Design an enzyme around this catalytic site. Structure first.
Site, PDB file in Angstrom:
ATOM      1  N   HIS A  19      52.600  32.796  43.491  1.00  0.00           N
ATOM      2  CA  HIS A  19      53.144  33.553  42.617  1.00  0.00           C
ATOM      3  C   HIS A  19      54.290  34.271  42.943  1.00  0.00           C
ATOM      4  CE1 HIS A  19      50.453  36.928  43.457  1.00  0.00           C
ATOM      5  NE2 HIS A  19      51.523  37.585  42.911  1.00  0.00           N
TER       6      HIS A  19
ATOM      7  N   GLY B 179      52.941  44.345  44.396  1.00  0.00           N
ATOM      8  CA  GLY B 179      53.794  44.699  45.438  1.00  0.00           C
ATOM      9  C   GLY B 179      53.155  44.364  46.820  1.00  0.00           C
TER      10      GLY B 179
ATOM     11  N   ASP C 188      46.922  29.791  45.240  1.00  0.00           N
ATOM     12  CA  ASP C 188      47.851  30.724  45.251  1.00  0.00           C
ATOM     13  C   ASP C 188      48.600  31.070  46.672  1.00  0.00           C
ATOM     14  OD1 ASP C 188      49.863  32.563  44.519  1.00  0.00           O
ATOM     15  OD2 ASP C 188      48.381  34.226  43.838  1.00  0.00           O
TER      16      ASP C 188
ATOM     17  N   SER D 270      51.290  41.618  46.905  1.00  0.00           N
ATOM     18  CA  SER D 270      50.869  40.108  46.756  1.00  0.00           C
ATOM     19  C   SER D 270      51.590  39.455  47.764  1.00  0.00           C
ATOM     20  CB  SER D 270      51.282  39.712  45.505  1.00  0.00           C
ATOM     21  OG  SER D 270      50.508  40.223  44.255  1.00  0.00           O
ATOM     22  N   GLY D 271      51.193  38.473  48.315  1.00  0.00           N
ATOM     23  CA  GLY D 271      51.565  37.506  49.333  1.00  0.00           C
ATOM     24  C   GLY D 271      51.316  37.973  50.715  1.00  0.00           C
TER      25      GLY D 271
HETATM   26  C1  LIG Z   1      55.207  36.224  36.918  1.00  0.00           C
HETATM   27  C2  LIG Z   1      54.465  35.233  37.551  1.00  0.00           C
HETATM   28  C3  LIG Z   1      54.387  33.957  36.432  1.00  0.00           C
HETATM   29  C4  LIG Z   1      54.925  34.605  38.511  1.00  0.00           C
HETATM   30  N1  LIG Z   1      53.029  35.742  37.642  1.00  0.00           N
HETATM   31  C5  LIG Z   1      52.876  36.999  38.434  1.00  0.00           C
HETATM   32  O1  LIG Z   1      53.945  37.738  39.050  1.00  0.00           O
HETATM   33  N2  LIG Z   1      51.335  37.334  38.620  1.00  0.00           N
HETATM   34  C6  LIG Z   1      51.076  38.340  39.336  1.00  0.00           C
HETATM   35  C7  LIG Z   1      49.398  38.081  39.809  1.00  0.00           C
HETATM   36  C8  LIG Z   1      49.189  39.302  40.412  1.00  0.00           C
HETATM   37  N3  LIG Z   1      49.312  40.466  39.872  1.00  0.00           N
HETATM   38  C9  LIG Z   1      48.036  41.350  39.670  1.00  0.00           C
HETATM   39  O2  LIG Z   1      47.026  40.890  39.711  1.00  0.00           O
HETATM   40  C10 LIG Z   1      48.391  42.722  39.316  1.00  0.00           C
HETATM   41  C11 LIG Z   1      48.527  43.952  40.512  1.00  0.00           C
HETATM   42  C12 LIG Z   1      47.918  43.240  41.801  1.00  0.00           C
HETATM   43  C13 LIG Z   1      48.422  42.358  42.453  1.00  0.00           C
HETATM   44  C14 LIG Z   1      47.728  42.006  43.608  1.00  0.00           C
HETATM   45  C15 LIG Z   1      46.253  42.573  43.875  1.00  0.00           C
HETATM   46  C16 LIG Z   1      46.050  43.669  43.164  1.00  0.00           C
HETATM   47  C17 LIG Z   1      44.587  44.153  43.165  1.00  0.00           C
HETATM   48  N4  LIG Z   1      43.812  44.705  42.255  1.00  0.00           N
HETATM   49  N5  LIG Z   1      44.002  43.753  44.376  1.00  0.00           N
HETATM   50  C18 LIG Z   1      46.684  43.632  41.828  1.00  0.00           C
HETATM   51  N6  LIG Z   1      47.303  43.245  38.541  1.00  0.00           N
HETATM   52  S1  LIG Z   1      47.234  43.569  36.857  1.00  0.00           S
HETATM   53  O3  LIG Z   1      48.531  44.232  36.636  1.00  0.00           O
HETATM   54  O4  LIG Z   1      46.144  43.881  36.371  1.00  0.00           O
HETATM   55  C19 LIG Z   1      47.615  41.771  36.106  1.00  0.00           C
HETATM   56  C20 LIG Z   1      48.991  41.488  35.579  1.00  0.00           C
HETATM   57  C21 LIG Z   1      49.309  40.264  35.304  1.00  0.00           C
HETATM   58  C22 LIG Z   1      48.319  39.113  35.443  1.00  0.00           C
HETATM   59  C23 LIG Z   1      47.368  39.369  36.211  1.00  0.00           C
HETATM   60  C24 LIG Z   1      46.403  38.284  36.345  1.00  0.00           C
HETATM   61  C25 LIG Z   1      44.986  38.530  36.522  1.00  0.00           C
HETATM   62  C26 LIG Z   1      44.196  37.479  36.803  1.00  0.00           C
HETATM   63  C27 LIG Z   1      44.757  36.115  36.692  1.00  0.00           C
HETATM   64  C28 LIG Z   1      43.664  35.024  37.238  1.00  0.00           C
HETATM   65  O5  LIG Z   1      42.707  34.826  36.214  1.00  0.00           O
HETATM   66  C29 LIG Z   1      46.117  36.117  36.867  1.00  0.00           C
HETATM   67  F1  LIG Z   1      46.509  34.721  36.708  1.00  0.00           F
HETATM   68  C30 LIG Z   1      46.639  36.906  36.499  1.00  0.00           C
HETATM   69  C31 LIG Z   1      46.894  40.658  36.225  1.00  0.00           C
HETATM   70  C32 LIG Z   1      50.677  41.036  39.573  1.00  0.00           C
HETATM   71  C33 LIG Z   1      51.246  39.744  38.693  1.00  0.00           C
END
Ligand SMILES: CC(C)(C)NC(=O)NC1CCN(C(=O)[C@H](Cc2cccc(C(=N)N)c2)NS(=O)(=O)c2cccc(-c3ccc(CO)c(F)c3)c2)CC1
Ligand SMILES: [Ca+2]
Length: 223
Positions: free
Chosen positions: A40, A175, A84, A177-178
Protein backbone atom coordinates in the site's frame (compact mmCIF):
# COMPACT_ATOMS: atom_id res chain seq x y z
CA UNK A 1 4.81 4.87 16.95
CA UNK A 2 2.54 5.65 19.94
CA UNK A 3 3.81 4.94 23.46
CA UNK A 4 7.33 4.01 22.38
CA UNK A 5 10.80 5.41 23.01
CA UNK A 6 13.57 7.13 21.06
CA UNK A 7 15.61 4.25 19.60
CA UNK A 8 18.98 5.98 19.48
CA UNK A 9 20.79 6.93 16.29
CA UNK A 10 21.43 4.00 13.91
CA UNK A 11 20.44 1.35 16.49
CA UNK A 12 17.97 -0.13 13.93
CA UNK A 13 20.32 -0.18 10.92
CA UNK A 14 17.93 -2.13 8.63
CA UNK A 15 15.24 0.58 8.94
CA UNK A 16 14.82 2.73 5.82
CA UNK A 17 12.70 5.80 5.06
CA UNK A 18 10.92 5.99 1.71
CA UNK A 19 11.03 9.58 0.44
CA UNK A 20 9.14 11.25 -2.43
CA UNK A 21 9.94 14.84 -1.40
CA UNK A 22 9.05 13.90 2.21
CA UNK A 23 9.00 10.72 4.30
CA UNK A 24 5.87 8.68 3.45
CA UNK A 25 6.52 5.06 4.61
CA UNK A 26 9.13 2.81 6.17
CA UNK A 27 10.90 -0.25 4.77
CA UNK A 28 13.51 -2.86 5.68
CA UNK A 29 16.85 -3.54 3.94
CA UNK A 30 17.14 -7.27 3.14
CA UNK A 31 20.39 -7.21 1.11
CA UNK A 32 22.59 -4.52 -0.45
CA UNK A 33 20.23 -4.13 -3.45
CA UNK A 34 16.71 -4.80 -2.10
CA UNK A 35 14.16 -3.33 0.34
CA UNK A 36 10.87 -4.89 1.45
CA UNK A 37 7.91 -2.64 2.31
CA UNK A 38 4.07 -2.63 2.24
CA UNK A 39 2.31 -2.81 -1.12
CA UNK A 40 0.00 0.00 0.00
CA UNK A 41 3.11 2.25 0.06
CA UNK A 42 3.60 1.78 -3.72
CA UNK A 43 4.18 4.89 -5.82
CA UNK A 44 6.54 6.08 -8.53
CA UNK A 45 9.56 8.28 -7.83
CA UNK A 46 10.80 6.58 -4.65
CA UNK A 47 14.13 7.53 -3.09
CA UNK A 48 15.30 5.09 -0.42
CA UNK A 49 17.03 6.77 2.55
CA UNK A 50 19.36 4.50 4.54
CA UNK A 51 21.38 5.29 7.65
CA UNK A 52 18.78 7.77 8.95
CA UNK A 53 18.06 8.96 12.46
CA UNK A 54 16.71 12.52 12.26
CA UNK A 55 14.97 12.54 8.84
CA UNK A 56 14.99 16.37 8.75
CA UNK A 57 18.77 16.82 9.38
CA UNK A 58 21.83 15.51 7.49
CA UNK A 59 23.84 13.89 10.29
CA UNK A 60 26.55 12.22 8.18
CA UNK A 61 25.68 8.49 7.92
CA UNK A 62 22.94 8.60 5.29
CA UNK A 63 22.83 7.00 1.86
CA UNK A 64 20.18 8.26 -0.59
CA UNK A 65 19.51 5.83 -3.48
CA UNK A 66 16.74 5.93 -6.11
CA UNK A 67 14.61 2.86 -6.75
CA UNK A 68 15.11 1.23 -10.18
CA UNK A 69 12.07 -1.06 -9.98
CA UNK A 70 9.22 -1.94 -7.64
CA UNK A 71 7.37 -5.28 -7.54
CA UNK A 72 4.02 -5.42 -5.74
CA UNK A 73 2.91 -8.90 -4.67
CA UNK A 74 0.86 -10.53 -7.48
CA UNK A 75 -2.08 -11.20 -5.10
CA UNK A 76 -2.15 -7.84 -3.28
CA UNK A 77 -5.74 -6.64 -2.71
CA UNK A 78 -6.00 -2.90 -1.94
CA UNK A 79 -9.55 -3.20 -0.56
CA UNK A 80 -8.69 -5.79 2.18
CA UNK A 81 -4.89 -5.31 2.39
CA UNK A 82 -4.40 -9.06 1.93
CA UNK A 83 -0.79 -9.70 0.75
CA UNK A 84 0.38 -6.19 1.76
CA UNK A 85 4.02 -6.62 0.62
CA UNK A 86 6.27 -5.22 -2.11
CA UNK A 87 9.94 -5.33 -3.09
CA UNK A 88 12.01 -2.28 -4.14
CA UNK A 89 15.33 -2.63 -6.00
CA UNK A 90 18.02 0.02 -5.50
CA UNK A 91 19.60 1.59 -8.60
CA UNK A 92 23.04 1.06 -7.02
CA UNK A 93 23.95 -1.26 -4.17
CA UNK A 94 24.06 0.24 -0.70
CA UNK A 95 27.45 0.28 1.02
CA UNK A 96 26.89 -2.00 4.01
CA UNK A 97 28.35 -0.87 7.34
CA UNK A 98 27.44 -0.82 11.03
CA UNK A 99 24.76 1.88 10.38
CA UNK A 100 23.38 0.42 7.10
CA UNK A 101 22.73 -3.30 7.50
CA UNK A 102 20.33 -5.97 6.27
CA UNK A 103 17.86 -7.93 8.42
CA UNK A 104 17.49 -11.71 8.02
CA UNK A 105 14.32 -13.24 6.61
CA UNK A 106 12.46 -15.83 8.67
CA UNK A 107 12.98 -19.47 8.00
CA UNK A 108 10.00 -20.19 10.26
CA UNK A 109 7.02 -18.19 11.50
CA UNK A 110 6.91 -16.92 15.10
CA UNK A 111 4.55 -17.82 17.93
CA UNK A 112 2.05 -15.79 19.92
CA UNK A 113 3.73 -14.30 22.99
CA UNK A 114 7.10 -13.74 21.32
CA UNK A 115 8.38 -10.18 21.86
CA UNK A 116 9.24 -8.05 18.81
CA UNK A 117 10.77 -4.63 18.00
CA UNK A 118 8.61 -2.30 15.85
CA UNK A 119 10.06 1.01 14.59
CA UNK A 120 9.28 4.06 12.47
CA UNK A 121 8.83 7.81 12.00
CA UNK A 122 5.01 7.72 12.16
CA UNK A 123 2.58 9.70 14.31
CA UNK A 124 3.19 9.46 18.08
CA UNK A 125 -0.33 10.46 19.22
CA UNK A 126 -3.39 8.23 19.70
CA UNK A 127 -5.59 11.34 19.51
CA UNK A 128 -4.32 14.09 17.25
CA UNK A 129 -1.09 14.30 15.28
CA UNK A 130 2.59 14.79 16.12
CA UNK A 131 5.37 13.55 13.87
CA UNK A 132 8.82 12.89 15.29
CA UNK A 133 12.02 13.64 13.49
CA UNK A 134 14.07 10.85 15.12
CA UNK A 135 13.34 7.13 14.88
CA UNK A 136 10.93 5.69 17.48
CA UNK A 137 10.85 2.12 18.81
CA UNK A 138 8.32 -0.14 20.55
CA UNK A 139 8.64 -3.58 22.12
CA UNK A 140 5.42 -5.54 21.66
CA UNK A 141 4.29 -9.20 21.69
CA UNK A 142 2.64 -11.17 18.92
CA UNK A 143 -1.02 -11.75 19.84
CA UNK A 144 -2.96 -14.96 19.32
CA UNK A 145 -4.79 -15.30 16.03
CA UNK A 146 -8.05 -15.80 17.95
CA UNK A 147 -7.67 -12.46 19.74
CA UNK A 148 -6.71 -10.84 16.42
CA UNK A 149 -9.82 -12.16 14.61
CA UNK A 150 -12.03 -11.33 17.60
CA UNK A 151 -10.79 -7.76 17.38
CA UNK A 152 -11.28 -7.58 13.59
CA UNK A 153 -14.05 -10.04 12.54
CA UNK A 154 -14.16 -10.83 8.84
CA UNK A 155 -10.92 -8.86 8.14
CA UNK A 156 -7.97 -11.10 9.15
CA UNK A 157 -6.46 -13.57 6.71
CA UNK A 158 -3.73 -16.14 7.18
CA UNK A 159 -1.32 -13.53 5.70
CA UNK A 160 -1.81 -11.19 8.69
CA UNK A 161 -1.04 -11.22 12.41
CA UNK A 162 -1.73 -8.86 15.29
CA UNK A 163 0.86 -7.50 17.72
CA UNK A 164 0.63 -5.03 20.56
CA UNK A 165 -1.54 -4.52 23.62
CA UNK A 166 -5.30 -4.99 23.81
CA UNK A 167 -5.50 -2.37 26.58
CA UNK A 168 -4.29 0.30 24.12
CA UNK A 169 -1.68 3.00 24.54
CA UNK A 170 1.19 1.32 22.60
CA UNK A 171 1.02 0.75 18.81
CA UNK A 172 2.34 1.64 15.39
CA UNK A 173 0.56 4.42 13.47
CA UNK A 174 0.26 6.45 10.25
CA UNK A 175 3.68 6.84 8.60
CA UNK A 176 5.07 3.65 10.17
CA UNK A 177 3.55 1.52 7.37
CA UNK A 178 6.01 -0.58 5.44
CA UNK A 179 8.49 -0.70 8.31
CA UNK A 180 9.81 -3.64 10.30
CA UNK A 181 8.62 -6.00 13.02
CA UNK A 182 11.71 -7.95 14.14
CA UNK A 183 11.42 -10.91 16.52
CA UNK A 184 14.41 -13.01 17.61
CA UNK A 185 16.57 -11.53 14.84
CA UNK A 186 14.12 -12.15 11.97
CA UNK A 187 11.85 -9.83 9.95
CA UNK A 188 8.50 -11.42 10.87
CA UNK A 189 6.22 -8.47 10.08
CA UNK A 190 5.60 -5.38 7.98
CA UNK A 191 3.54 -2.53 9.47
CA UNK A 192 0.26 -2.79 7.52
CA UNK A 193 -2.93 -1.37 9.16
CA UNK A 194 -5.10 -0.85 12.22
CA UNK A 195 -8.33 0.77 13.38
CA UNK A 196 -7.00 4.10 14.60
CA UNK A 197 -3.80 3.90 16.64
CA UNK A 198 -3.29 2.57 20.19
CA UNK A 199 -7.04 2.18 20.77
CA UNK A 200 -8.46 -0.38 23.19
CA UNK A 201 -9.17 -3.76 21.55
CA UNK A 202 -7.75 -2.57 18.18
CA UNK A 203 -4.17 -3.87 17.97
CA UNK A 204 -1.81 -3.35 15.05
CA UNK A 205 -2.11 -5.66 12.04
CA UNK A 206 1.06 -6.78 10.27
CA UNK A 207 1.89 -8.62 7.05
CA UNK A 208 3.04 -12.16 7.90
CA UNK A 209 6.48 -12.18 6.22
CA UNK A 210 7.12 -15.90 6.82
CA UNK A 211 4.45 -16.71 4.18
CA UNK A 212 6.44 -14.78 1.53
CA UNK A 213 10.05 -15.97 1.90
CA UNK A 214 9.92 -18.24 -1.17
CA UNK A 215 8.38 -15.45 -3.27
CA UNK A 216 10.98 -12.94 -2.01
CA UNK A 217 13.94 -15.22 -2.73
CA UNK A 218 12.74 -16.25 -6.19
CA UNK A 219 11.74 -12.70 -7.17
CA UNK A 220 15.09 -11.16 -6.21
CA UNK A 221 17.02 -13.96 -7.98
CA UNK A 222 15.10 -13.25 -11.23
CA UNK A 223 15.28 -9.41 -11.14
C1 LIG B 1 -4.38 5.17 -0.21
C2 LIG B 1 -4.20 3.66 -0.34
C3 LIG B 1 -5.22 3.09 -1.31
C4 LIG B 1 -2.79 3.34 -0.82
N1 LIG B 1 -4.40 3.07 1.00
C5 LIG B 1 -3.71 3.40 2.11
O1 LIG B 1 -2.87 4.29 2.14
N2 LIG B 1 -4.05 2.67 3.20
C6 LIG B 1 -3.34 2.78 4.47
C7 LIG B 1 -3.56 1.51 5.28
C8 LIG B 1 -2.91 1.63 6.65
N3 LIG B 1 -3.39 2.81 7.37
C9 LIG B 1 -3.98 2.67 8.57
O2 LIG B 1 -4.35 1.58 8.97
C10 LIG B 1 -4.22 3.91 9.44
C11 LIG B 1 -2.94 4.30 10.19
C12 LIG B 1 -2.12 3.11 10.63
C13 LIG B 1 -1.13 2.60 9.81
C14 LIG B 1 -0.42 1.47 10.17
C15 LIG B 1 -0.67 0.85 11.38
C16 LIG B 1 -1.65 1.35 12.23
C17 LIG B 1 -1.88 0.76 13.57
N4 LIG B 1 -2.86 1.12 14.33
N5 LIG B 1 -1.02 -0.18 13.98
C18 LIG B 1 -2.39 2.47 11.85
N6 LIG B 1 -5.32 3.68 10.37
S1 LIG B 1 -6.75 4.36 10.03
O3 LIG B 1 -6.53 5.77 9.94
O4 LIG B 1 -7.69 3.86 10.99
C19 LIG B 1 -7.21 3.77 8.43
C20 LIG B 1 -7.42 4.67 7.40
C21 LIG B 1 -7.79 4.20 6.16
C22 LIG B 1 -7.94 2.84 5.94
C23 LIG B 1 -7.73 1.92 6.97
C24 LIG B 1 -7.92 0.47 6.75
C25 LIG B 1 -8.31 -0.38 7.79
C26 LIG B 1 -8.49 -1.73 7.57
C27 LIG B 1 -8.31 -2.30 6.32
C28 LIG B 1 -8.41 -3.78 6.08
O5 LIG B 1 -9.65 -4.33 6.49
C29 LIG B 1 -7.95 -1.43 5.30
F1 LIG B 1 -7.80 -1.95 4.06
C30 LIG B 1 -7.75 -0.09 5.48
C31 LIG B 1 -7.36 2.41 8.23
C32 LIG B 1 -3.12 4.05 6.63
C33 LIG B 1 -3.80 4.00 5.26
CA1 LIG C 1 19.20 12.48 8.52
Amino acid sequence: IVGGYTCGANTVPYQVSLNSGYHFCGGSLINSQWVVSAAHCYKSGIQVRLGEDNINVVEGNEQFISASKSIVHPSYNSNTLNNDIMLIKLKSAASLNSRVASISLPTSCASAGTQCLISGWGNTKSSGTSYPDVLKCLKAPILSDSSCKSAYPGQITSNMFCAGYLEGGKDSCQGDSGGPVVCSGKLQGIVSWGSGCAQKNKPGVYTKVCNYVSWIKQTIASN
